[PDB]
């Protein structure tokens, strides 16, 4: 349905302290929404940190 989901369009990996390494292709759900950076949870190891919005895909589903 409608949510906060979005898709990492590119590889990265954590490097502050709340962080969160994805890939290219990968799915993560959103926490909260700031503006530069979002704190989101990748639901492929249950995780949540950071995710550069300007490299990631918003999706509601």
Do not use: C
């Not at 502050?16 to 994805?22: A, V, Y």
């Not at 799915?27 to 503006?35: N, T």
């Not at 989101?40 to 950071?50: F, V």
């Amino acid at each position: 349905s409608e949510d906060i989901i979005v898709v990492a369009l590119y590889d990265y990996e954590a490097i502050h302290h709340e962080d969160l390494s994805f890939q290219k292709g990968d799915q993560m759900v959103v926490l909260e929404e700031s503006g530069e950076w979002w704190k989101a949870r990748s639901l492929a190891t249950r995780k949540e940190g950071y995710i550069p919005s300007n490299y990631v895909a918003r999706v509601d589903s």
